[PDB]
C-alpha cells in the first residue's frame, strides 16, 4: 500500500488548481489532439430517415503539461469519473442526429495519464448519424456516408486535430459486416471548415458502401420477372378465350404496380425515378402492352393474320423483353 | 403454419387443375393465375421477418421449388390447352 | 365459410363460376390467418383462433375439392 499512497499523493497535486475552464496552453499555440477510431459496428442503415448508426470507441489523445508527473513509472488508469475534473476536447460530429455513450456497468469512458502529460481519453458512442443518399441508381448503388468530427467552441488558432496513425487511425472497418451493404472502402481527411465565428478544424471519416443487389433479385426482380413471364402466357391462348386472357391480363397488370406500389412505401418520398421505378416501370409496359396485345386482337376480329399477329407476339415479346434486360442491366451493372 | 403450410397448400390447389376437363379454359386458367399470384406475395412476405441478408434461405429455396410446381402447373396447362382441337366439351 | 357453400347450390356445368367462388373464398381464409397472426407474436403453437380458422379452411377446401369431385365423375 505504501505505493499506493504515493500514487494518491501524485494524482491529488494534478487536480489541486487545476483550471477546467482553460485548455492546455491557454493563451497560446493550439493544441494538437490526435483521434483513432475503432468501428465496432454499423447497423441501421435506413435510407427511410437517411442516417446510419455507428458504434465505435472513440479516443483522443493531446498533451496537457499540468497533468505531468515524473516519480510514477507506470501510466495511470484512473477512474472514468476523473474526467468530469478534466479539461477535453468539446469534440462533436456535425452529421449526428441522435448519440449516447454507453452507461452499463458503469459510462464507457477511460481516463489514461502518461508521464510525460499525454492524455487518452476513450468513449464508447453510438451516434446516429445523417447520410444523404442518391437513390437514383437504387438498388444497384453506392452510397458515400461520412462522420463530420469538429471542434465546437475552439478554433483553428486553439486546437488542431490530426488521425492518430494516419491511415491507420480507423480499425475494425474490414470485419464489419453489414447484412445488406459491403463497405468497399473508407477514407480519412483532414479539413478546415469555417463559419462566421471562425475557421475549425475538421476530421472527416467517410465509408463506400455498395448495395448487395442479392436481397433485391429474391424479393424485387425475380417476382417482376415472373410475372412478366407469366402474362406472355396469354399469348398461346386461342383468341376467343376472352375471359381466360383478360383474367391473365389484368392480374399481372394490377399485381405489377401493387408490387411497384408496395415497394415505394417502404422508402422515402423522394421525388426522382430510381433503377427498381425503371425496371418495375419497364415491366409494367410489356404486361400493360400484353393485354393491350389481345385488345387489339379482339378489334381485329370483331370488330388468318390474326394468329399472325398473335404468332409474331408469341416471340418478339420474349425477344424485346430481353434486349430490354440487356440494355437495363449492362447499363446499370 | 405461417409459410410452409401456406406454400404447401397453394401447390396443391395448383394440382387440382389437372383433375378438371381440358375446356374449362377460364376456370384452369384462374386456378394457375390465382396460385402463381399466391404464391408471389407468399414469397415476399415470408422474406419480411428476417433482415436483408444477401445470401438463400433454405424458406427461400422451398419457396422457389413450390414456385416451380405451381408456374409448372400453369404451363403444363398451356401446353394442353395448346392441343385441345375443340372448345365444347364432353355433354351428356 | 357460409358463402362457400353458395357454390353446391350452382349448376354443375359452370367450372368458371364455382372455382372461381371456391378458389376466391380458399385464398381468402389464407389471407385472414395470416392477417390475424401477424398481429400476435411469433408464437410457436396453435391457438384457439388458430385451431378455428384451420377448422374453417378445411371445410372450404372440401367444399372446392367437392366441385373438382364433381366435375371428374362428369367428365372424366
Ligand atoms: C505507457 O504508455 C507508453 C505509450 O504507449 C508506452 O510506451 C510505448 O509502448 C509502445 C507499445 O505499444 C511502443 O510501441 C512500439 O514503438 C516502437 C518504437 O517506436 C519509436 O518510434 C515511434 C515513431 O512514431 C515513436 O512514436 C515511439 O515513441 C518510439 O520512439 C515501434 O517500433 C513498435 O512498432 C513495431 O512493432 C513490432 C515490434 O517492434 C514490429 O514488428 C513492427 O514492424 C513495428 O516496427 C511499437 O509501435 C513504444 O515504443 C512506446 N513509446 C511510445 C509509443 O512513445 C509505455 O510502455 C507505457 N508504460 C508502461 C507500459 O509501463
Ligand atoms: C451533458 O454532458 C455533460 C458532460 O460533461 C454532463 O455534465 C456532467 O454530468 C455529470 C452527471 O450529473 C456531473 O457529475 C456530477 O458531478 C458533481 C460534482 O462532483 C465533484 O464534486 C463533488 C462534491 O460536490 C465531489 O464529491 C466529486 O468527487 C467531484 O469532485 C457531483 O456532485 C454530482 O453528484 C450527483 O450525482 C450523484 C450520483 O451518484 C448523486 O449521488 C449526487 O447526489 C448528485 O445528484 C454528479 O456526479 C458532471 O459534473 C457534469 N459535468 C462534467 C464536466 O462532467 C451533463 O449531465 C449532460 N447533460 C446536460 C443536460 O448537460
Ligand atoms: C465521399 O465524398 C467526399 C466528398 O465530399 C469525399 O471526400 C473528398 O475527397 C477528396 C479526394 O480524396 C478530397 O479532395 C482533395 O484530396 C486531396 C488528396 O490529395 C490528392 O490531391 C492533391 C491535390 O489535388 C494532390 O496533390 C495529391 O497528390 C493527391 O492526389 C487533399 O490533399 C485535398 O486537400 C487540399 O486541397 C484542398 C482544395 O485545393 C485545399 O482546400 C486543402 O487545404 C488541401 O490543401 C482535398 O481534400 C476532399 O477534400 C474530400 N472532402 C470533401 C470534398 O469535402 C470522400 O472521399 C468520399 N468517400 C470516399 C470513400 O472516397
Ligand atoms: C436473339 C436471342 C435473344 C435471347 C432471347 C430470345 C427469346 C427466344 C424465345 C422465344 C419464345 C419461344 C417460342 C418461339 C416460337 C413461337 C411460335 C411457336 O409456337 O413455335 C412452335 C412451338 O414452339 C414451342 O414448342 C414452345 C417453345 C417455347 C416454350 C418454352 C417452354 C419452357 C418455359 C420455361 C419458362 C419458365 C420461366 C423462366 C424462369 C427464368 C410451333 O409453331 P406454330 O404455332 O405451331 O406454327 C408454326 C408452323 N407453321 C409455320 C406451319 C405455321
Ligand atoms: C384499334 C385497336 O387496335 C384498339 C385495341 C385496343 C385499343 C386501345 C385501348 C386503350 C384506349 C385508351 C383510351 O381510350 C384511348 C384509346 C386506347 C389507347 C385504344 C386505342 C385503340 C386500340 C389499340
Ligand atoms: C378422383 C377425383 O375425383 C379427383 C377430383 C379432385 C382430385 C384431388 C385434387 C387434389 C389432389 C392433390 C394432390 O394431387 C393429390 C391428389 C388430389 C388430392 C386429388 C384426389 C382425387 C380427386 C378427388
Ligand atoms: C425519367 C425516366 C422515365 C422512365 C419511364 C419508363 C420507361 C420504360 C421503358 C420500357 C421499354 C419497353
Ligand atoms: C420525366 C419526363 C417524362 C418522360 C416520359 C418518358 C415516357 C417513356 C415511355 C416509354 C414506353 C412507351
Ligand atoms: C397496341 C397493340 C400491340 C400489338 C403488338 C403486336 C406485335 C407484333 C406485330 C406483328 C404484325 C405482323
Ligand atoms: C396499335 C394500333 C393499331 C391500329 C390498327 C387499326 C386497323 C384497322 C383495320 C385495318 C387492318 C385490318
Ligand atoms: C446482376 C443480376 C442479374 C439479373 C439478370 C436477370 C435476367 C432476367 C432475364 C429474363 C429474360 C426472359
Ligand atoms: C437472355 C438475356 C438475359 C439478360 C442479360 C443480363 C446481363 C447481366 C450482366 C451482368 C453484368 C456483366
Ligand atoms: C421466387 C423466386 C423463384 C425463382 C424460380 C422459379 C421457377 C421458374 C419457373 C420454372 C418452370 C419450369
Ligand atoms: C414463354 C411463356 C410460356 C409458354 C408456355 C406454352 C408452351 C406451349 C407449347 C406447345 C407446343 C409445343
Ligand atoms: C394440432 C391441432 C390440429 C388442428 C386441425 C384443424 C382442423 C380440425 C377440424 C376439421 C373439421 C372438418
Ligand atoms: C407437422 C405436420 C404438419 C402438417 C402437414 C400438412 C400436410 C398437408
Ligand atoms: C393433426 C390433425 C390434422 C387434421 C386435418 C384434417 C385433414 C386435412
Ligand atoms: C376422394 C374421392 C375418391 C373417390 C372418387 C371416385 C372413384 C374414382
Redesign the interface.
Known sequence: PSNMSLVKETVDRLLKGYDIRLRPDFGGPPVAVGMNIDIASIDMVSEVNMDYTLTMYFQQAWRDKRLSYNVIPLNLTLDNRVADQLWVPDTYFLNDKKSFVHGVTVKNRMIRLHPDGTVLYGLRITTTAACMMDLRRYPLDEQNCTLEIESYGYTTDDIEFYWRGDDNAVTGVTKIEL??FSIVDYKLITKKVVFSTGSYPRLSLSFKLKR????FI??TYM?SI??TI?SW?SF???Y??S??RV??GI??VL?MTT?NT?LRETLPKIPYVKAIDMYLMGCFVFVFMALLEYALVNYIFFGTDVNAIDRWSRIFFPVVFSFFNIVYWLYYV | ??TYL?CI??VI?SQ?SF???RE????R??????T???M?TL???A?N?L??????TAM?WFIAVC?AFV?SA??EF?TV??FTKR?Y??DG
Not at chain 1, 212 to 215: A, K, M, P, Q
Not at chain 2, 24 to 27: H, I, Q
Open positions: 447484412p445488406q448487395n443487389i442479392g436481397y429474391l424479393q417476382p415472373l410475372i407469366l402466357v398461346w391462348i386461342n376467343d378465350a375471359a381466360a383474367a391473365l392480374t399481372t399485381t408490387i408496395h | 403454419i405461417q401456406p397448400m397453394t390447389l387440382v383433375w378438371l376437363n374449362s379454359v377460364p376456370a386458367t384462374v386456378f394457375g393465375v390465382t402463381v399470384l399466391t408471389t414469397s415476399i412476405s422474406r421477418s433482415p436483408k441478408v444477401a445470401y438463400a427461400d414456385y408456374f400453369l404451363i398451356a390447352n395448346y372448345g366439351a364432353w
